[PDB]
Amino acid sequence: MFTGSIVAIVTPMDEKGNVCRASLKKLIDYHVASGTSAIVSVGTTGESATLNHDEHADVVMMTLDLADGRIPVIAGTGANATAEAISLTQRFNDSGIVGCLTVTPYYNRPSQEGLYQHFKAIAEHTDLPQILYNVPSRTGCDLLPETVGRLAKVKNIIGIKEATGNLTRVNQIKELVSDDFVLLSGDDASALDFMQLGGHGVISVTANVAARDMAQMCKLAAEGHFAEARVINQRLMPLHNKLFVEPNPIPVKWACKELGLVATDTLRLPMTPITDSGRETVRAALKHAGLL
Template sequence: MLTENVHIAVPTAFYEDESLNVQGTISHIRGLYKQGVKSVLVSGTTGEQHSLNLQEKIEIINGLELEEELINNMEIIFGVASIRQKEAEELAEKIRPTRISGIMLGYPPYVIPTQEEAFVYTKKIIDLSNKPTILYNNPKRTGFDLSEKSIIQLSKIDLVIGIKDAGNKEKVERIKKGLHRNDFYFYAGGEVDLEEKVSYGYNRLSSIAGNVAPTEFRQWFQKILNKQKVNKQEYEIIENIMKQVFQANTIVSLKKIINDKSIPIGICRKPIGNILD
């Protein structure tokens, strides 16, 4: 199972012509590993997942499988989602025999399946991947909101270990009341409003700002969980980095900071980043 309570949602590297840069992506992960990061989410968030086609996702998986030190010593979670279930199934089948630690299962954008259709989609992909699974509910990006009933029903599957961005306080409270297990985790997607989310039940973090300062944000999150006081100096550091990361378009800001550290994370695929022209 997935034991780390923080993973870093890493951006995908692209060359100037917008083609995939697998080694650039891995270079960034390697840099995080050297800073003590134990878990990363690849191709699962930061708004880039659906710009990658199936073959590109497979190329990233193949590249990760060659990185013995990383694949053997980190929890590497891979994002699985597609507007077509058939492609998500192919990706799940590809992941099954690998040393990928788990998957984050997202829902198709735009098409808005029914709750019943989404349940079948979820069950099929979990069966094919046979990996610990974090459900990813992101109605802002997809238009689909996984219901409380669906989340509770899916939580009965042993491989489903939690959900990212379950919803607001009231929804989380109702889900928790309906659960029949204690080992089901609620992942906050990024650091915005993190203290508030922890106050009503979120207990794990899918970190964005951790790409820039992994140690500082892991320690900050741990203090929030433990209800420990964050001193003024620590908070000023956190606040300053968050201002840099979450200004304007987050992924554009994040890539600029990473590139400035001489890590070849590259550009975003247009229309993201158009304003830079």
């Protein structure tokens, strides 16, 4: 089930930049306790960009193991070469992950036909459920509703993580896909609006440090208690924004460390330690949300 508050979980690292298992276990336990619906392992927020495919796989398998059946795990499987997307997706075949989150090729800027071919080929080499992921500001590429429509016709392409923040997409996509195709926000600041328009949940950065509020907000939203959800949202909104005061996941990793959830806020270059001014910004926002 790909609904509700789904965390794009940080990959906690030791001071050397390698996965820290104690901190991962702790984060996973926190999400199990907190009511988080599922975990996305090595998405954008999990530093897919700076992990090689072996390291990437190690983190996913380790996340799966530690989740220990208590919470479903979705593997990030994006690559800008179709052959590499297939090959990464194959690692997780018959593994216990429940689906894949797969981003539009970045940098090489395919046509809509190229995007169609890319995702169709990936979905054909797998039985795993596929969630498409559109994030033009990172990729240089925009997966348009008409093409989500085409791809939704492939049996195991089952959802989209829509990160544009362009709310008109929720109903442009909905009208082109079956009732069971799932529409997830990839933008925390607009994700409650997204759900109010008919979206089914959010793949959240905010949920890393505010898992309980996020899960409650998404459940309120799903029950149509939009006014009640919005009280939570307005408490989380400074966070929704300030977790991007510097490049994700620089802010949210610091926040995790500040909350005692991870041992170190280490990232891999080209991500750099949070600035002193970033700290104070994110600290303010944690306080506003009643977490500090």
